[PDB]
């Protein structure tokens, strides 16, 4: 039975509004309703992995697991296995997989982050799950961010706290946050970003939604505008939105948006908004294709509609050679030429690099770079031809060209990372000098760039 080179992943996010679900929720898992929907011809084809994020979830873990498993069983006639379940307050993540993936899934981690302080600590935050699927690392984050149209900067801060403090994936990747630890990272939830238009325009917005004319609404979506201004979710992707706003509905119908200020809302307006979102970040040149992104029309117990997204994702096999794992493959090497880091820092410490990759036995520390003053004020750290030669555990090009090198640039004085990035080994040529580039981030914000050339030698 061959190992797969692709899997499909279902991502669901649903703010349940503290109400039990209706008896039938299959439309969610089938990607049916509004937006980019799944073809009917696929209905009986199970996804490989289902990741369900809820917010304001009133059910016990046992109650929700039984509903989810019975739902998937009805759709597919497959009894899915529970990979992980983790709950913080009323924010929950469930990961289910085809039982045929029992010996492909390992290194399962869960964690949560509570956002806010004092007044604002006690119901918002995030849960997450990671695991390995054969040679591929997968991370999943369900976050419930701060509510309210005038709190976009709070949401952005909640995002930064979650990606700093959520402890998933390989702890040996010590300089790296969750935005670098996974081949594929999916981040979803009630992100709570709103359509920033004046309150007086509520009925105009409703009209536009009835016409399915979303362009003038999406141009004011706070998540899209904050992303475009690099304030949040830097280097994440989102499919185009082609479904109506998923909040705030009168319960038991989808015919009415309930937007007016009420004592129950803290006298706040809830203009129709795309609160409920799925974004992703995959390592460079790894296959990932969104195959659905939409909302259900027939699940009406909450003031939010469920959101679905599905993906094709590239995966690699757990490679064994005659040599690695447990030795090097002399026949392989990774060389770096004309390399320099450009950093936004005002500091003047010496810097060194660390190279981390599951194609290395352990991470590799470089010598210190040579600091120069860049012409527009920046710091340029030159490595030139000084970087170590990396010795992969396996030299087979079918393995090595699928790998990635994580890079951290660290202060010699504090051993703190000033920037993290990722280089793909999926090169156009081997034994050939080729340009490489990554942006560098720290705490998920841009701090610089790393560029140079690479020379990859495989067994072929
Ligand atoms: C242009 C930018 C963007 C697109 C639509 C909305 C917000 C944005 F920031 N992309 C972000 C993801 N990667 C490629 C570039
Ligand atoms: C429970 C879990 C599992 C079973 C089926 C499908 C996926 C999955 F992660 N185990 C992983 C490690 N090996 C034993 C099984």
From Swiss-Prot:
Tyrosine phosphorylated by the members of the SRC family after exposure to a diverse array of extracellular stimuli such as cytokines, growth factors, antibodies, chemokines, integrin ligands and hypertonic and oxidative stress. Phosphorylated upon IgG receptor FCGR2B-binding. It comes from the Eukaryota. Phosphatidylinositol (PtdIns) phosphatase that specifically hydrolyzes the 5-phosphate of phosphatidylinositol-3,4,5-trisphosphate (PtdIns(3,4,5)P3) to produce PtdIns(3,4)P2, thereby negatively regulating the PI3K (phosphoinositide 3-kinase) pathways. Able also to hydrolyzes the 5-phosphate of phosphatidylinositol-4,5-bisphosphate (PtdIns(4,5)P3) and inositol 1,3,4,5-tetrakisphosphate. Acts as a negative regulator of B-cell antigen receptor signaling. The SH2 domain interacts with tyrosine phosphorylated forms of proteins such as SHC1 or PTPN11/SHP-2. It competes with that of GRB2 for binding to phosphorylated SHC1 to inhibit the Ras pathway. It is also required for tyrosine phosphorylation. The NPXY sequence motif found in many tyrosine-phosphorylated proteins is required for the specific binding of the PID domain. Belongs to the inositol 1,4,5-trisphosphate 5-phosphatase family. Interacts with tyrosine phosphorylated form of SHC1. Interacts with tyrosine phosphorylated form of DOK1. Interacts with tyrosine phosphorylated form of DOK3. Interacts with tyrosine phosphorylated form of SLAMF1/CD150. Interacts with PTPN11 in response to IL-3. Interacts with receptor EPOR. Interacts with receptors MS4A2/FCER1B and FCER1G. Interacts with receptors FCGR2B and FCGR3. Interacts with receptor FCGR2A, leading to regulate gene expression during the phagocytic process. Interacts with GRB2. Interacts with PLCG1. Interacts with tyrosine kinases SRC and TEC. Interacts with c-Met/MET. This is Phosphatidylinositol 3,4,5-trisphosphate 5-phosphatase 1. It comes from Homo sapiens (Human). The lineage of its organism: Eukaryota, Metazoa, Chordata, Craniata, Vertebrata. The chain holds residues 398 to 857 of 1189 of the full protein.
């Amino acid at each position: 039975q061959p190992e797969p080179d692709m899997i499909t992943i279902f991502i669901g996010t649903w703010n349940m509004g503290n109400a039990p679900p209706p008896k039938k929720i299959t439309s969610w898992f089938l990607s049916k309703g509004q937006g980019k929907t799944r073809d009917d011809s696929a209905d009986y084809i199970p996804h490989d992995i289902y990741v369900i994020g809820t917010q304001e979830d009133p059910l016990s873990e046992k109650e929700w697991l039984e509903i989810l498993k019975h739902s998937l069983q009805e759709i597919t006639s497959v009894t899915f296995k529970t990979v992980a379940i983790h709950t913080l307050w009323n924010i929950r993540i469930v990961v289910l997989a085809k039982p045929e993936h029992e010996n492909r899934i390992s290194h399962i981690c869960t964690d949560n982050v509570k956002t806010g302080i004092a007044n604002t600590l006690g119901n918002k935050g995030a849960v997450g799950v990671s695991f390995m699927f054969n040679g591929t690392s997968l991370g999943f984050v369900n976050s419930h961010l701060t509510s309210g149209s005038e709190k976009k900067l709070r949401r952005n801060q909640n995002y930064m706290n979650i990606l700093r403090f959520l402890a998933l994936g390989d702890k040996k990747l010590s300089p790296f946050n969750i935005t670098h630890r996974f081949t594929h990272l999916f981040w979803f939830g009630d992100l709570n970003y709103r359509v920033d238009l004046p309150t007086w325009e509520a009925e105009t917005i409703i009209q536009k939604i009835k016409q399915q004319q979303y362009a003038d609404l999406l141009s004011h979506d706070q998540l899209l505008t904050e992303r475009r201004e690099q304030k949040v979710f830097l280097h994440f992707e989102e499919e185009e939105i082609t479904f109506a706003p998923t909040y705030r509905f009168e319960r038991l119908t989808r015919d009415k948006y309930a937007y007016t200020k009420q004592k129950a809302t803290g006298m706040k307006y809830n203009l129709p908004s795309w609160c409920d979102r799925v974004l992703w970040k995959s390592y460079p040149l790894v296959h990932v294709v969104c195959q659905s992104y939409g909302s259900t029309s027939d699940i009406m117990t909450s003031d939010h509609s469920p959101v679905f997204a599905t993906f094709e994702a590239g995966v690699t096999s757990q490679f064994v050679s005659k040599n690695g794992p447990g030795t090097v493959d002399s026949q392989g090497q990774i060389e770096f030429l004309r390399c320099y880091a450009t950093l936004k820092t005002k500091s003047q410490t010496k810097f060194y690099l660390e190279f981390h990759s599951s194609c290395l036995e352990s991470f590799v520390k470089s010598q210190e770079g040579e600091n120069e003053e860049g012409s527009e004020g920046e710091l340029v750290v030159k490595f030139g031809e000084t970087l170590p030669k990396l010795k992969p555990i396996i030299s087979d090009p079918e393995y090595l060209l699928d790998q990635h090198i994580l890079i951290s640039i660290k202060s010699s004085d504090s051993d703190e990372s000033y920037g993290e990035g990722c280089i793909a080994l999926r090169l156009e040529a081997t034994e050939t000098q080729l340009p490489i580039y990554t942006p560098l981030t720290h705490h998920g914000e841009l701090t610089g760039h790393f560029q140079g050339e690479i020379k990859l030698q495989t067994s072929q």
